[PDB]
Amino acid sequence: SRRRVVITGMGMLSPLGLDVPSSWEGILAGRSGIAPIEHMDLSAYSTRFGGSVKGFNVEEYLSAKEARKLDLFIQYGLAASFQAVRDSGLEVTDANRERIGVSMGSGIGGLTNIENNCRSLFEQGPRRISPFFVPGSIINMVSGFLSIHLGLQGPNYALTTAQTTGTHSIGMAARNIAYGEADVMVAGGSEMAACGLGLGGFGAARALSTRNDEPTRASRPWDRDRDGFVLSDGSGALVLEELEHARARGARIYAELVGFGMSGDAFHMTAPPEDGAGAARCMKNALRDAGLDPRQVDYINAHGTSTPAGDIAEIAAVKSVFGEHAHALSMSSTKSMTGHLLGAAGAVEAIFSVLALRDQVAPPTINLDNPDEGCDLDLVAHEAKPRKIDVALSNSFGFGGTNGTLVFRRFA
Amino acid sequence: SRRRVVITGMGMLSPLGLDVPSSWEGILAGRSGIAPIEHMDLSAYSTRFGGSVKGFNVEEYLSAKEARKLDLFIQYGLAASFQAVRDSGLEVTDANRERIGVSMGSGIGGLTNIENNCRSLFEQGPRRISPFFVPGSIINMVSGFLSIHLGLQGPNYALTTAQTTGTHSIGMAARNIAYGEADVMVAGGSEMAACGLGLGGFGAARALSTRNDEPTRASRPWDRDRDGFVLSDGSGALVLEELEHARARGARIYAELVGFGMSGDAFHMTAPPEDGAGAARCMKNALRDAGLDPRQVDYINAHGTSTPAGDIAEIAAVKSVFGEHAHALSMSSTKSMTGHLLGAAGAVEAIFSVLALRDQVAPPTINLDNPDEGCDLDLVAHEAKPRKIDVALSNSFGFGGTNGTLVFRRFA
Ligand SMILES: CC(=O)N1Cc2ccc(N)cc2C1
């Protein structure tokens, strides 16, 4: 039957740093990775800032010759994938390669790449479209390229479920191992949507904070002055591993993955139900899946996108699932500092959640100066809060009424 | 032990018709759906033909208002999903809605919408980007929109595994049911990449047939004159159902899905290994999953893309897997008539594999006028072949070395 699943490796690019420890240091210090965007000219855009990955050197991972053929999202996913695999100390052999797979996803994928070849197509013509446009841009090629580079011959796929992609990717990889389709999976996601179509598209839908004159205070989840999410780039990857396999080889285990929930809201293409009915169903499935009393949950890492409707939905979802225990746990949004990595949001927040467990600290919600109507839970405003965390939960919600929950606990 | 999964409903948009019975009539008569592409200037392109969905009326499915928000690939996916659900006679209720989920995917997604919003971005700047650009273009919106429209609250997600997408979607939907996460799933894929960026993308990699003089003859898997694949558009969708839930409501069962294989080649970003190592591993994994010996397999719907390296690698794979049984089974490429629907290839080709079981006939590989070196198997050249079929394989292989196999068995 169902095997248990532990975290043996983590890798990350965020607007807070080029690895996990540097990113985490910023999280505990309540530092913002949000700044005006420099790689393009956004004077015609209603939003001109985001969470860029700053100082990324792809030639720490790939030959410039390969890197040139690949969209930044693919570069970011490989960067985090390679970190996580090295962090696991796992050796890939002919003996285990067929039992090691990969599920790295993206919400949008190679939008910069499609934008640039679109430029070439319209300004010059079809014959200037790169021969590398398809394999360098489509979402499954983080899983593809990682498998080619490392010899991973296990299950090879990618999810695209918008802002839920990282949680879905991690959770379903765990089910791969749980049910014995694999002993190891590299799982998470990557996003680089900070191009014309991305900032314009989200801008057109009026979803983005337009606080161009103070980018670091734009992402203010549950604050009454919130005006949309902040668009950020990066990657999260975890090495998920069957528990006995991890023990046999003496792997360092950060935490166990005990619970995964999915659920459609069936409510609206882009709007979350104000009652949190979808988040509620999802967390309930995931806590059942983990065989837990909801009162065991100590820390929740919220979706916490800093949109009006999304944030309030999540208070209502947590009050409804946890009843009075909603006032005992701590809930925070690391999106306060990183902004919204979209399909990678689930991945980086999975790792922040595992790190709350290791270090016994609730990350802060920075910029929560004036909590909104009903937002009366412990939201770890401003400053990290050292506390007892046995069980941590990470929530994601996306367009299509798509929901995911991951439940982690300490392994000893 | 594990719940059994059956097919109770099927839906399709293809170059051979706007539904399954019309597509299947096409298939068994050896008709081509390939023609010069219209309503689009391909003067500057090396390929000017493909498999277009001819005569599609989205308003049979959606309001004009709904449909104007959504890329053709999503319209195609919804059409297939709606056909399939209706074909199943499933009643969605408050009692069962949490146990009905969706896994509809795409290889490439919303190229045509990205192209048109790009046209507007480059000519007039970002204030001409549709506010429905993002949710109207991202790959999870077939699953999103279907779930919202039918009120489905089960597992809500999408796969994107290039030309393997449709197969992976159906396969991992089947897993959700087997391991009791859902009782019903709508699964498959949709694709409409016949924009400048698709034909130009694949054209730039010289992956496409350039036989503009005889478009019906361009797709010729295992023929010595083949010169790359034909780009085709459309959708497949299956209603997957746990057996006891099918029988309890007196569902018409087309066939049972007994076996699912995934596997990475870990070989090359675009190229398959010459010896079908990947396809071999994947078919072996799928037959082991089904608890079947290779001698039990009667019909294989090949990937059969009409690429020099792709077609011959599949011959290698089958010979390696089926040894002294490889000439006994019939193996045909329906891409000989449909061309390559990319991420929807696996969905439509799963349906054709189910109807091969229902009607006891192997669909032809048309245009196999001169089989290449080593292509001495029963590739059902030119005409449909009635024969005994108890076990059917549908193989899919994609960029990133991503493999998928589905094993269907007759039900009586
Ligand atoms: C043409 C056809 O087969 N259908 C099935 C179906 C199901 C639901 C909705 N909204 C619309 C339609 C149209």
B250 Cα to the center of ligand 1, angstroms: 22
Closest to A394 (Cα-Cα) out of A258, A270, A266, A272 = A258
Provide the pairing of β-strand B234-242 with B184-191: antiparallel
Tell me which chain A residues have a C-beta less than 8 angstroms from the C-beta of B261.
none
- When CB atoms are compared, the residue of A156, A160, A263 closest to B262 is A156
Same domain for B412 and B312? yes
Question: Distance, in angstroms, between A131 CA and closest chain B CA?
Answer: 4
Closest to B319 (Cα-Cα) out of B300, B292, B346 = B300
Give the count of beta carbons closer than 10 Å to the beta carbon of residue B322: 22
Question: Distance, in angstroms, between B76 CA and closest chain A CA?
Answer: 17
**Residue A327 buriedness (CB in 10 A; 0-12 / 13-18 / 19+):** exposed
Query: Is B179 in contact with A181 (Cβ distance < 8 A)?
Result: no
Q: Is B49 in the pocket of ligand 1 (CB under 6 A)?
A: no
Closest to A162 (Cα-Cα) out of B141, B82, B187 = B141
Torsion angles phi and psi, residue B98, rounded to 5: -75, -10
B236 Cα to the center of ligand 1, angstroms: 15
A262 Cα to the center of ligand 1, angstroms: 27
E strand intervals along A183-271: 184-191, 234-242, 255-264
Ligand 1 atom at shortest distance from the alpha carbon of B11: 3
The two three-digit tokens of residue B1, written as one number: 């032990």
Query: Is A121 in contact with B196 (Cβ distance < 8 A)?
Result: yes
Query: Is B44 in contact with A398 (Cβ distance < 8 A)?
Result: no
The two three-digit tokens of residue A61, written as one number: 């991972």
Query: Is A201 in contact with B129 (Cβ distance < 8 A)?
Result: yes
Q: Classify A146 as helix, strand or coil.
A: helix
Tell me which chain A residues have a C-beta less than 8 angstroms from the C-beta of B69.
269
Q: Kindly state whether residue A1 falls inside one of the protein's structural domains.
A: no
Q: Classify A361 as helix, strand or coil.
A: strand
Tell me which chain B residues have a C-beta less than 8 angstroms from the C-beta of A98.
263, 281
Q: Is B367 in the pocket of ligand 1 (CB under 6 A)?
A: no
Q: Kindly state whether residue A320 falls inside one of the protein's structural domains.
A: yes
Q: How does DSSP assign A95-137, residue by residue?
A: TTGGGEEEEEE-SS-SHHHHHHHHHHHHHT-GGGS-TTTTTTT
C-alpha–C-alpha distance, residues B326 and B344, integer Å: 27
The count of CB pairs under 8 A between chains A and B is 288
Same domain for B205 and B73? yes
Provide the pairing of β-strand B100-105 with A49-50: unpaired
C-alpha–C-alpha distance, residues B22 and B14, integer Å: 9
C-alpha–C-alpha distance, residues B76 and B12, integer Å: 8
Q: In a mutagenesis test of the A interface, which of B141, B269, B342 is the best target, namely the one with the most A β-carbons within 10 Å?
A: B269
Tell me which chain A residues have a C-beta less than 8 angstroms from the C-beta of B101.
262, 264
Question: Of A259, A289, A317, which closes a domain?
Answer: A259
Count of domains observed in chain A: 2
Closest to A45 (Cα-Cα) out of A57, A54, A37 = A37
Same domain for A237 and A92? yes
C-alpha–C-alpha distance, residues A259 and B18, integer Å: 42
From atom 13 of ligand 1, which residue's Cα is the shortest distance away?
A: B61
B82 Cα to the center of ligand 1, angstroms: 5
B323 Cα to the center of ligand 1, angstroms: 45
Query: Is B269 in contact with A144 (Cβ distance < 8 A)?
Result: yes
Query: Is B144 in contact with A206 (Cβ distance < 8 A)?
Result: no
Same domain for A190 and A71? yes
Q: Is B89 in the pocket of ligand 1 (CB under 6 A)?
A: no
Neighbouring-strand partners of residue B301: B332, B394
**Residue A323 buriedness (CB in 10 A; 0-12 / 13-18 / 19+):** exposed
Do A285 and A297 touch, CB atoms closer than 8 A? no
Question: Distance, in angstroms, between B250 CA and closest chain A CA?
Answer: 27
Question: Distance, in angstroms, between B206 CA and closest chain A CA?
Answer: 8
Q: Is B86 in the pocket of ligand 1 (CB under 6 A)?
A: yes
Question: Distance, in angstroms, between A157 CA and closest chain B CA?
Answer: 6
Q: Kindly state whether residue B157 falls inside one of the protein's structural domains.
A: yes
Same domain for A292 and A239? no
Same domain for B372 and B336? yes
Tell me which chain A residues have a C-beta less than 8 angstroms from the C-beta of B141.
269, 399-400
Neighbouring-strand partners of residue A79: none
Q: Is B148 in the pocket of ligand 1 (CB under 6 A)?
A: no
From atom 2 of ligand 1, which residue's Cα is the shortest distance away?
A: B83
Query: Is A134 in contact with B179 (Cβ distance < 8 A)?
Result: no
Q: Is B61 in the pocket of ligand 1 (CB under 6 A)?
A: yes
Q: In a mutagenesis test of the B interface, which of A68, A119, A123, A153 is the best target, namely the one with the most B β-carbons within 10 Å?
A: A153
Q: Kindly state whether residue B1 falls inside one of the protein's structural domains.
A: no
Do A142 and A104 touch, CB atoms closer than 8 A? yes
For A64, A79, A81, A84, B154, the CA distances from A61, given in Å and listed in that order, are 9, 6, 10, 13, 39
Tell me which chain B residues have a C-beta less than 8 angstroms from the C-beta of A118.
114-115, 118, 122, 197
Q: In a mutagenesis test of the A interface, which of B156, B305, B403 is the best target, namely the one with the most A β-carbons within 10 Å?
A: B156
Q: Kindly state whether residue A56 falls inside one of the protein's structural domains.
A: yes
The two three-digit tokens of residue B249, written as one number: 């409501």
Q: Classify B342 as helix, strand or coil.
A: helix
From atom 3 of ligand 1, which residue's Cα is the shortest distance away?
A: B83
Same domain for A266 and A235? no
Which chain A residue has the Cα nearest residue B110?
A: A108
Closest to A100 (Cα-Cα) out of A45, A51, A155 = A155
Question: Of A232, A259, A286, which closes a domain?
Answer: A259
Q: Is B103 in the pocket of ligand 1 (CB under 6 A)?
A: no
Query: Is B157 in contact with A262 (Cβ distance < 8 A)?
Result: yes
Entry resolution (Å): 2.2
Closest to B80 (Cα-Cα) out of B152, B166, B172 = B166
Question: Of A259, A293, A316, which closes a domain?
Answer: A259
Ligand 1, residues B10, B19, B60: which to mutate, most atoms within 8 A of Cβ? B60
Ligand 1 atom at shortest distance from the alpha carbon of B61: 11
Same domain for A225 and A306? no
Q: Is B254 in the pocket of ligand 1 (CB under 6 A)?
A: no
The range of the structural domain enclosing residue B158 comes to: 6-259
Same domain for B228 and B316? no
Q: Kindly state whether residue A63 falls inside one of the protein's structural domains.
A: yes
Looking at B89-164, list the stretches that DSSP marks H as alpha helix, in order from N- to C-terminal side: 111-124, 141-150
User: Which residues are CB-neighbours of B229 under 8 A, at least 6 positions away?
Assistant: B202, B207, B208, B209, B219, B305, B306, B307, B310, B335, B339, B340
C-alpha–C-alpha distance, residues A166 and B338, integer Å: 35
For A188, B344, B349, the CA distances from A21, given in Å and listed in that order, are 17, 41, 47
Same domain for A312 and A203? no
From atom 1 of ligand 1, which residue's Cα is the shortest distance away?
A: B60
Q: Kindly state whether residue B42 falls inside one of the protein's structural domains.
A: yes
Method used for this model?
X-ray
**Residue B323 buriedness (CB in 10 A; 0-12 / 13-18 / 19+):** exposed
Do A160 and A106 touch, CB atoms closer than 8 A? yes
Q: Is B82 in the pocket of ligand 1 (CB under 6 A)?
A: yes
Same domain for B85 and B226? yes
- When CB atoms are compared, the residue of B175, B200, B402 closest to A144 is B402
Question: Distance, in angstroms, between A139 CA and closest chain B CA?
Answer: 7
User: Which residues are CB-neighbours of B295 under 8 A, at least 6 positions away?
Assistant: B322, B325, B328
Same domain for B317 and B234? no
Looking at A228-290, list the stretches that DSSP marks H as alpha helix, in order from N- to C-terminal side: 243-248, 277-289
CA A296 to chain centre: 24
